[PDB]
Design a protein around this ligand. Sequence first.
Ligand SMILES: [Zn+2]
Lengths: 198, 416, 163, 52
Amino acid sequence: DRATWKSNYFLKIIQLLDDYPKCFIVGADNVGSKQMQQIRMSLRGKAVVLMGKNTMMRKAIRGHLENNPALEKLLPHIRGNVGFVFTKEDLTEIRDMLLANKVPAAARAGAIAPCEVTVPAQNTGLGPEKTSFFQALGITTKISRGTIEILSDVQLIKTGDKVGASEATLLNMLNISPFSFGLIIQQVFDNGSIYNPE
Amino acid sequence: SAADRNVEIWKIKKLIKSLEAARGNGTSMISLIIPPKDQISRVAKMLADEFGTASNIKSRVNRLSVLGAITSVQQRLKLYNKVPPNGLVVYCGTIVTEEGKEKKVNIDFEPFKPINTSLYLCDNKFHTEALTALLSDDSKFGFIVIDGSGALFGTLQGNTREVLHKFTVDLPKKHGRAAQSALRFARLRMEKRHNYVRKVAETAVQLFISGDKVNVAGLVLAGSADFKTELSQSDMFDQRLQSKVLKLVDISYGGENGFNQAIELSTEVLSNVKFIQEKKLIGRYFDEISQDTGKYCFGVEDTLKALEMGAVEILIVYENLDIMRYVLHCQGTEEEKILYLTPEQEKDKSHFTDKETGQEHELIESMPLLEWFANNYKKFGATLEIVTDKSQEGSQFVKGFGGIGGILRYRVDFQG
Amino acid sequence: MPPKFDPNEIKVVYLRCTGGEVGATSALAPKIGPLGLSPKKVGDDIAKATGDWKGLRITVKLTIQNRQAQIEVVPSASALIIKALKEPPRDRKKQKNIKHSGNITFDEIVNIARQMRHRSLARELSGTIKEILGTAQSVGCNVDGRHPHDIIDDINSGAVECP
Amino acid sequence: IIEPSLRQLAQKYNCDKMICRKCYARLHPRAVNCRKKKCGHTNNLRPKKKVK
RNA sequence: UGGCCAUGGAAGUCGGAAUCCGCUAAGGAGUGUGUAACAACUCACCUGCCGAAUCAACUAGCCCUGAAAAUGGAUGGCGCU
Ligand SMILES: [Zn+2]
């Protein structure tokens, strides 16, 4: 194990490179197995998704094989948490399909905020429970007959702001999930030419 | 096997129920019972005199039925050469029944458990009060009997008086007639004496334990000279055995002649054990009602539903409760339903018309629920705990709670 | 169903499993049952009627409540349908030694099993599904007198027929 | 009653510990061996039992 | 995939016969926590950072734990690193 498998992994990546002349480098990021399965089910017919390591630092060996240049441009961009998407359809269409899929995934306590997150005026869906968790920071909440109702549309977290722990937990209890993303596109490979999501 | 024993018990329980219902004429029946030690010839002699005296019964019907009943039992007893262990229970007669069917009947059987009860009777009906009284009191108690001469071990069902094991010992003298050696010999005497307690305690673990969990519901020490007290409170005595020590009896005499003295003294305390186990259980049930908790049930509407569903852990029942399981049936459509009814709701009830269709819904005959609980608690959740109305907690459970409840496996919600 | 007692439509589903016969220990209704208008004994009788004459060796019970009428269905599990297609039927009470005979062939019968799978598996068609259901069998032991393991590798059938 | 993050901070100091099976020494939870020369750095350790 | 035995509940998890395939980058028909039972949590394969050794299982030397006695005390004593 892990000598024959390592050789089998080299055979997987080279065959995918030989089959498809176009690849889409996608950042994995905070991602679930459930997400990856959903993406597999959506992109089943056309594309083939892969997730690699520093044996993707091995496109060099494909470029060595009595043929290819152009794969030399792709070596620096295999950094961070990276996985590939091999495919033959198109480039701008596939970019739109990747952007369109995505997933919610609830608040990460500590990380940055991508958009201006809000709390709409609505009931929590509980009995006479702790209103003190909501009112600790600066939110107007009443016990309007049993249910804890928020009485105003207020912005908690703004763009480029750090998400606190107590406010993250309250958003998770409310089922408000603007944070996270799913997966991001950093760079592209299209028959030799490189693009930067443009 | 344990399962085969339970089937043999149920077989006899069923048989017993059918014999109590029997009924017959004048005093044509016989209820005869023989203990295991007894000789059959002596019994066959007794019946031969009872046959002779019966020859001068004035009334016809009775006389001829009696003599034939006495001849049958005499012939059944010819087949056995000895009275078997567990005794013998002979039930002869000529029972009247439906269809005007005055039929002869004979049931000799060696019962399960040993019986220490003799009985000769004739009557209009059979008398199985001995057998049913046995079947209730399965509770065995142990009897360790210490003496400076030698020990004894035996057990004690409600009826039967057993001997398990006994030994005698060559113990030393009280005194040592030297000044210096007095002390050494006195220590030596006390070490021999302690080794004897150890042996008795070891043999007691040998006898009274079963699968690292003692069979005897209690245990009694019975002696004199603070020798039982040596055993009772010693660290030598295994705590699983020691925790069931209920009485330390003070007896004159020793061994098997002291044994039956120890039983006579220990009677009230050995009767109270069932009453104590009742209190402990219903006390445990009532604590759940005292707190919020919600790991309880009560009423045949609830307690059964709880048993049907996410099952109970313990199913408390009062003997007397009288609530019964009928099976109702339709004439035309062949629809049916079973319900658990009270004494007045079962005797006469205009509820049972089918209504939706418009027919009379005939209530096909019952069986009554204590019996139903016993039939299939094993196929539910189990520990069918029969309790009485004697204890203060039991009295509440019977009078207040309707004599039915349960301690559940977890919390359960109920509505309506 | 939220505030007090209201059916706006009620096509409510919940998943019970196991149901050869009525069952004394039941555990069918409560919790979900009574609140929602489905009863207990009648619901057990309806559950027996659907899961009657096959399967009597364990079944699955999705319960779609239409206000008061439950629609019990048998959604297929792989091992259940293998046990249904065994050497039937010695149902209950001996029995006893035990339910693991496991020499009942099924070569082209498992083709139907891979077809009846509710898509699932993230597969590249039956070629891979054949390998899965040929090993799901804890009991069966594959064809006539074969093993499962590595005979699966050399399949020569039903690649294009199963879609 | 008590603020959760504040609680877990005081747990860290009182309850997130290893315990020596020989000498009952209270040890940091990463511990593989004991501190105590009295029990010869036993290595028979167990976790401190959590309050239910 | 409520896999099978076990219903008293074990859909990975009181126990035991099993014990493979798919997706696979890859996850045991499951190390535990805990559950009536789930859930929820926790325990490979792979990356990002950092920057050369790292780690396991035995084995035997000294040292230490194991190592409790009654007048105050004896490597002979003083002492000795
Ligand atoms: Zn220690």
